[PDB]
RNA sequence: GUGAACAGCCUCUAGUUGAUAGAAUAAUGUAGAUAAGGGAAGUCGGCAAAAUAGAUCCGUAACUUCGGGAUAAGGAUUGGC
RNA sequence: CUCUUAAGGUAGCCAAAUGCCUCGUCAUCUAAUUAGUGACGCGCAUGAAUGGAUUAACGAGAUUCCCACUGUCCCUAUCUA
RNA sequence: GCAGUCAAGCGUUCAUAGCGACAUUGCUUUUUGAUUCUUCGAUGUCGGCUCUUCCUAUCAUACCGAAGCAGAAUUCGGUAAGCGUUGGAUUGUUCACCCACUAAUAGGGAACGUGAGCUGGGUUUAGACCGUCGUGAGACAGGUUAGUUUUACCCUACUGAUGAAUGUUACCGCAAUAGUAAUUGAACUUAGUACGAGAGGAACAGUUCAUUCGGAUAAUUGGUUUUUGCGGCUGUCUGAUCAGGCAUUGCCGCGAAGCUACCAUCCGCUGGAUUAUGGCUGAACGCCUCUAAGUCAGAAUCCAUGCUAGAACGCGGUGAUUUC
């Protein structure tokens, strides 16, 4: 089994937990929690979010 | 006048009446069919629901899309320290039913059991079994006579056993006492196995093994008094309706002139007893072992207990049954694992599982880490721990 | 699902009830696909029959070539916006809802499918799997 | 004070602090909220609810009793220093 | 040409808030429309200040559709007084 | 409305596979009449929504018999009401009609079930328009528009909740009686096989899923936020700061925990006996015959198993049983 990584934060995503978004251009995004994903959806900038 | 359109009714009339159970330990109303050609063992066991975690394993289901592929699965862990045998009960068949002939108790009873016989223990003088223990002190006889009285007569034999709840994280000091049927051979060998195990202790591994199908007997979590909508699953009424929409519109036809046993009504929901069957053992946990949450594939040394412990429970310091899926009743509740009533081949039933990985991350919120070790790696070093 | 299926389809959450309008992802010249029925569906009083990805719906075209509109045709859901969960345990979802025009067999009216497609839809309909770009 | 403003929101003076009270927090209510995906498929009917909203710039159709229609429609902007 | 009783429906309008038959027929809108709109008119029983036709603007009037919007619904869940 | 009997005739041949004229015997009371017994010091009047239960004259599904059954399809029939019987366009509608899915979209009852359950579109007061009628006031089963839907705290019933008393108290148990539950589909394979000239085109066994239903459950994902937990923003107030108050939770973002979702996951048992039916042996009747005696098999059925409650006037085993 394969630990993936949050496309926003950089947190380790174990099996199960988190969501997987597939953008219309087919680029894949993985989020470890509804927080990260929301930030992404808010169009926030992971370079400016301190805990990322 | 013949309802406009048909739909099946709401709720299963076989689970009536829906009331609060007559006790928090749910009853084992059936035991596996005895095959007396085998060694004498217990047909069930006592434990406490700790909580749940997840699991990753490869599926053996040839012909399925996911055959030879990795799946995740929910699992409940049952905290199941061993049990100690305090007694034996003979049961005799009668034209009016099964009847209890005698009961014989071990000479010394753990204070956890004695606690169960008392409503107010602290101020009681704890007269316990005190006069009953004289039956041993007299060399023999009165215990032996009844012990043989069981052999001479009883068709069924059961051991009274009780949980060691001090080993268990709960605050409750009152242990749980239960009858378990003895499914090995030969009522004599049964009662012999019984008294040889007086004051002795029996462990989960003696009863269940990996991949075994088992049934869970538990009192479902109580919700109290409930409206018809969520108790019976009725459709909600429209918004426009006077005097509330969470009701049932027509509770009865004009005739019969009584509202009927079969109609949905508000009242108690949950705290019902449930016998839930066909749950596969994904793990027989090992009390002393520190690999409790480990795997051949994932070799990191860790226990089954997550980070921050099992929420609202504690840590698993004893042997644990980790069974697939979910189980009736809630965390901390005494539960009864009972081995299956019927021989089930299925396919799903006979598959052997071996886990690749067990989730130890915290259930107190969304955990990013498995061991506190793994955390220090990712996190680095904080202002704390200077 | 539909008929002409290759293999099974495990259950996945239903995002596309009747009345839903999904994007048309093929080159047939259709833009809208407005779902009037779901082929595989069972029945319960007042339940809207709802399609997931890989299901074969029946639809009409509300935006597209006039030759293609004002009539009922099959369609297959390539992408769904509501999250479902695969047996491996990831919850995933697409950025829009999309479908492709098919025929009862599943042979597509389109010669190409623009945009991604979930493996579920592909594994179930080879003719879709043929015409499609990146999958999942 | 904020603001176009006797708006709404906060305040000085002045007047009040009066509307049986204690404990809980089931069901159903009355009133107030939020909902994944779909988006009127609900219903006699979009009933209810939701969406719109100030100001600046831009752009603004048919029709017309030439006065209108018009805030039509459609867009962009908006803090702080 | 006739006919009872003075005349014998003109300009217009129409399945119209007036049409029985009737869910009239044709076209349009819809996957499907006793709905809507445009037509047609021997119009049971439209029709000229008993006012006829038209009509910009106005309307807590009646009606249909579209976009937006939404717990109206799929299908229900949770929160506060 | 539903069904018998006779069998002229239909069905190439051929009464009866499937049908059926002339007649004739019936059942039914979800049709309409006929009647006027009940109710006029009042039984809320259409439809819908919701929910339960019953009927069977069976639409599907289980097991079958018949065919003008090669296969495939269909049709007739038996045991069957166990289980299910849907989603929309127009209409107030019941009804109707169409679109669509479906195993199938069967028909009915319960004061034409159900208004102190809703709703109030329709009908059926009082306002108003039109058409037709009338000198007029006004009328119409004609079209149209607007038009207050009250009360339960009693008894019973139902749902769930306590409980005196049967020495006391406590623990483990029994099980009378009652309730009961799972339904249905598809794919692969069998097999391009059987059968057929062909066109076509099955099934049992095996495998994977699914559907409606039901019971739980919260690891996960999602929902919810007075954790008013952290942050952010507006206005005003506290001289400034820091830290805060007020705007009926001021507003926004995230938000654990709990609750919760086919929007989440898990689980949903085993026998015995029968029905129709097909048979064994086998008389009546030296033959024949499933039947008379006897007996074999056999269904989504029955009785259990399993599951729920536990009789508060059903019961068993057991522990301890009082000193200011
Ligand atoms: N359709 C479901 C049921 O099908 C029954 O009959 C169906 C069957 O006889 C037939 O279906 C067959 C099936 O028997 C058989 N075991 C598998 C086959 N794939 C199916 O028929 C097939 O026809 C074509 C050509 O082969 C395929 O391409 C298509 O995928 C499939 N529909 O198609 C009929 C129509 O669907 C009954 N009509 C009825 O119970 C119900 O309609
Ligand atoms: N006009 C906006 C102003 O700001 C606020 O209004 C904003 C929000 O309150 C409102 O939020 C609504 C929510 O109330 C409603 N119940 C649901 C809706 N999805 C939300 O809105 C938003 O939803 C998502 C993003 O979350 C977007 O897809 C959507 O386009 C967006 N309008 O969206 C509004 C902007 O469109 C206040 N209501 C008021 O001050 C005023 O209306
Ligand atoms: N659809 C694929 C396969 O084809 C099958 O084929 C069946 C169908 O082709 C046809 O069944 C018809 C059906 O079309 C129609 N819609 C209903 C009808 N009662 C059925 O009839 C059939 O089945 C019933 C019930 O099982 C029997 O009682 C009857 O004797 C039989 N002729 O006859 C076959 C059964 O005798 C089934 N549809 C299905 O179960 C199977 O998987
Ligand atoms: N699962 C496959 C499909 O679903 C069903 O398949 C079921 C059958 O194959 C079989 O079910 C049998 C059924 O055949 C038979 N005719 C009735 C029986 N009750 C059913 O059995 C079921 O209920 C009994 C208790 O009654 C339980 O003991 C048993 O474990 C349970 N599977 O087991 C399957 C699951 O229960 C349908 N028959 C059919 O649509 C198709 O085979
Ligand atoms: N057959 C026993 C085993 O359990 C399963 O079988 C279960 C069912 O599929 C099987 O169904 C049989 C049916 O095949 C057989 N031809 C008739 C029998 N009465 C049915 O069984 C079921 O029938 C009805 C269902 O409501 C019940 O009354 C009955 O008690 C129940 N056993 O009955 C079994 C339960 O006893 C599987 N076949 C398999 O696991 C294994 O063979
Ligand atoms: Mg969350
Ligand atoms: Mg019915
Ligand atoms: Mg009715
Ligand atoms: Mg029913
Ligand atoms: Mg019992
Ligand atoms: Mg039992
Ligand atoms: Mg001893
Ligand atoms: Mg302890
Ligand atoms: Mg300890
Ligand atoms: Mg503790
Ligand atoms: Mg063992
Ligand atoms: Mg509670
Ligand atoms: Mg509630
Ligand atoms: Mg429900
Ligand atoms: Mg009201
Ligand atoms: Mg209800
Ligand atoms: Mg065995
Ligand atoms: Mg948690
Ligand atoms: Mg800290
Ligand atoms: Mg395109
Ligand atoms: Mg093109
Ligand atoms: Mg193009
Ligand atoms: Mg289906
Ligand atoms: Mg359907
Ligand atoms: Mg409805
Ligand atoms: Mg290509
Ligand atoms: Mg490709
Ligand atoms: Mg100013
Ligand atoms: Mg002011
Ligand atoms: Mg008062
Ligand atoms: Mg109070
Ligand atoms: Mg409430
Ligand atoms: Mg309210
Ligand atoms: Mg919010
Ligand atoms: Mg929504
Ligand atoms: Mg949304
Ligand atoms: Mg939209
Ligand atoms: Mg609507
Ligand atoms: Mg509608
Ligand atoms: Mg309507
Ligand atoms: Mg409104
Ligand atoms: Mg709101
Ligand atoms: Mg200008
Ligand atoms: Mg001009
Ligand atoms: Mg504008
Ligand atoms: Mg205009
Ligand atoms: Mg600036
Ligand atoms: Mg004329
Ligand atoms: Mg005239
Ligand atoms: Mg003239
Ligand atoms: Mg003139
Ligand atoms: Mg006309
Ligand atoms: Mg009209
Ligand atoms: Mg006009
Ligand atoms: Mg009209
Ligand atoms: Mg309409
Ligand atoms: Mg029309
Ligand atoms: Mg018209
Ligand atoms: Mg005319
Ligand atoms: Mg004319
Ligand atoms: Mg006429
Ligand atoms: Mg006139
Ligand atoms: Mg006049
Ligand atoms: Mg005049
Ligand atoms: Mg006139
Ligand atoms: Mg005029
Ligand atoms: Mg206007
Ligand atoms: Mg208006
Ligand atoms: Mg208007
Ligand atoms: Mg208006
Ligand atoms: Mg809302
Ligand atoms: Mg009849
Ligand atoms: Mg002839
Ligand atoms: Mg013949
Ligand atoms: Mg009649
Ligand atoms: Mg009378
Ligand atoms: Mg009368
Ligand atoms: Mg009276
Ligand atoms: Mg009267
Ligand atoms: Mg009265
Ligand atoms: Mg009454
Ligand atoms: Mg009244
Ligand atoms: Mg009436
Ligand atoms: Mg019958
Ligand atoms: Mg039949
Ligand atoms: Mg039919
Ligand atoms: Mg012949
Ligand atoms: Mg045929
Ligand atoms: Mg057919
Ligand atoms: Mg017939
Ligand atoms: Mg029934
Ligand atoms: Mg219908
Ligand atoms: Mg409707
Ligand atoms: Mg309608
Ligand atoms: Mg017809
Ligand atoms: Mg019908
Ligand atoms: Mg019919
Ligand atoms: Mg009456
Ligand atoms: Mg009647
Ligand atoms: Mg009635
Ligand atoms: Mg009543
Ligand atoms: Mg009323
Ligand atoms: Mg009524
Ligand atoms: Mg009314
Ligand atoms: Mg009324
Ligand atoms: Mg009336
Ligand atoms: Mg009136
Ligand atoms: Mg007149
Ligand atoms: Mg009216
Ligand atoms: Mg009206
Ligand atoms: Mg009014
Ligand atoms: Mg009215
Ligand atoms: Mg009133
Ligand atoms: Mg009331
Ligand atoms: Mg009263
Ligand atoms: Mg007690
Ligand atoms: Mg007990
Ligand atoms: Mg083949
Ligand atoms: Mg072929
Ligand atoms: Mg051949
Ligand atoms: Mg031939
Ligand atoms: Mg051949
Ligand atoms: Mg088969
Ligand atoms: Mg099989
Ligand atoms: Mg539930
Ligand atoms: Mg909040
Ligand atoms: Mg200060
Ligand atoms: Mg402030
Ligand atoms: Mg203040
Ligand atoms: Mg406010
Ligand atoms: Mg105020
Ligand atoms: Mg505050
Ligand atoms: Mg949130
Ligand atoms: Mg949560
Ligand atoms: Mg099952
Ligand atoms: Mg299942
Ligand atoms: Mg069971
Ligand atoms: Mg069993
Ligand atoms: Mg048998
Ligand atoms: Mg014979
Ligand atoms: Mg026989
Ligand atoms: Mg006999
Ligand atoms: Mg005889
Ligand atoms: Mg037999
Ligand atoms: Mg059954
Ligand atoms: Mg008991
Ligand atoms: Mg008792
Ligand atoms: Mg009794
Ligand atoms: Mg007595
Ligand atoms: Mg005695």
């Amino acid at each position: 089994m394969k630990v993936e990584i949050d496309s926003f934060s950089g947190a380790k995503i174990y099996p199960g937990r988190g969501t997987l978004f597939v953008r219309g251009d087919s680029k894949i995004f993985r989020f470890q929690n509804s927080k990260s994903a929301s930030l992404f959806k808010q169009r926030k900038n992971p370079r400016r979010i301190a805990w990322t | 006048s013949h309802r406009k359109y048909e739909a099946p009714r709401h709720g299963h009339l076989g689970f009536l009446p829906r009331k609060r159970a007559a006790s928090i330990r749910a009853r084992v109303k059936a035991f596996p069919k005895d095959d007396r050609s085998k060694p004498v063992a217990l047909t069930s066991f006592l434990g406490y629901k700790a909580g749940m975690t997840t699991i990753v394993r490869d599926l053996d289901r040839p012909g399925s899309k996911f055959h030879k592929r990795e799946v995740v699965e929910a699992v409940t862990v049952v905290d199941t320290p061993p049990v100690v045998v305090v007694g034996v009960v003979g049961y005799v068949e009668t034209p009016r039913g099964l009847r209890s002939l005698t009961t014989v108790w071990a000479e010394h009873l753990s204070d956890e059991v004695k606690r169960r016989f008392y409503k107010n223990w602290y101020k009681s003088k704890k007269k316990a079994f005190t006069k009953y223990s004289a039956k041993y002190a007299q060399d023999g006889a009165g215990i032996e006579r009844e012990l043989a009285r069981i052999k001479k007569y009883a068709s069924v034999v059961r051991v009274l056993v009780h949980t060691q709840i001090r080993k268990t994280p709960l605050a409750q000091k009152k242990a749980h006492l239960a009858e378990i049927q003895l499914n090995g051979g030969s009522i004599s060998e049964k009662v012999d196995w019984a008294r040889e195990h007086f004051e002795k202790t029996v462990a989960v591994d003696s009863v269940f093994e990996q991949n075994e199908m088992i049934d869970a007997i538990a009192v479902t979590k109580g919700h109290g008094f409930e409206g018809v909508t969520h108790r019976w699953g009725t459709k909600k009424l429209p918004r426009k309706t006077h005097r509330g929409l969470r009701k049932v519109a027509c509770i009865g036809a004009w005739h019969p002139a009584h509202v009927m046993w079969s109609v949905a009504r508000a009242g108690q929901r949950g705290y019902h007893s449930r016998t839930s069957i066909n749950h596969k053992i994904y793990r027989v946990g090992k009390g002393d072992d520190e690999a409790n949450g480990a795997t051949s594939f994932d070799r990191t040394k860790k226990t089954i207990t997550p980070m921050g412990g099992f929420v609202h429970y504690g840590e698993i310091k004893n042997d644990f049954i980790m069974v697939k899926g979910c189980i009736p009743g809630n965390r901390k509740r005494i539960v009864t694992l009972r081995k299956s009533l019927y021989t089930n081949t299925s396919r799903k039933a006979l598959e052997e599982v071996s886990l690749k990985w067990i989730d130890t991350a915290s259930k107190f919120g969304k955990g990013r880490f498995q061991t506190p070790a793994e955390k220090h790696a990712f996190m680095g070093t904080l202002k704390k721990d200077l | 699902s539909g008929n002409g299926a290759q293999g099974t389809k495990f259950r996945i959450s239903l995002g596309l009830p009747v009345g839903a309008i999904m994007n048309c992802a093929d080159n047939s010249g259709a833009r809208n696909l407005y779902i009037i029925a779901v082929k595989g569906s069972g029945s319960r009083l007042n339940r809207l029959p709802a399609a997931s990805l890989g299901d074969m719906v029946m639809a009409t075209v509300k935006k597209g070539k006039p030759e293609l509109r004002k009539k009922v045709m099959p369609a297959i859901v390539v992408r769904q916006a509501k999250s479902w969960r695969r047996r491996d345990g990831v919850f995933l979802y697409f950025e829009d809802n999309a479908g492709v025009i098919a025929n009862p067999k599943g042979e597509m009216k389109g010669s190409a499918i623009t945009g991604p497609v979930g493996k579920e839809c592909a594994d179930l309909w080879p003719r879709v799997a043929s015409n499609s770009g990146v999958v999942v």
Side-chain angles (χ1 to χ4, degrees), chain B residues 354-373:
Chain B
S354 70
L355 315 147
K356 261 172 166 184
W357 167 75
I358 310 185
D359 187 346
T360 182
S362 163
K363 283 81 183 58
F364 202 42
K366 338 278 192 57
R368 337 228 296 185
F369 313 94
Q370 299 292 288
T371 55

Side-chain angles (χ1 to χ4, degrees), chain A residues 20-36:
Chain A
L20 197 155
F21 174 52
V22 182
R23 180 164 62 201
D25 71 358
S26 318
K27 179 126 175 45
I28 287 180
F29 302 78
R30 282 179 248 256
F31 309 114
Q32 204 271 306
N33 51 61
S34 40
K35 177 196 204 180
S36 307

Side-chain angles (χ1 to χ4, degrees), chain B residues 15-36:
Chain B
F15 290 89
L16 273 39
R18 276 148 92 123
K19 76 206 280 295
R20 319 210 273 258
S23 142
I24 188 157
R25 181 178 46 117
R27 290 175 307 184
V28 177
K29 277 141 130 185
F31 284 104
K33 185 186 85 172
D34 189 356
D35 174 26
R36 278 131 132 98

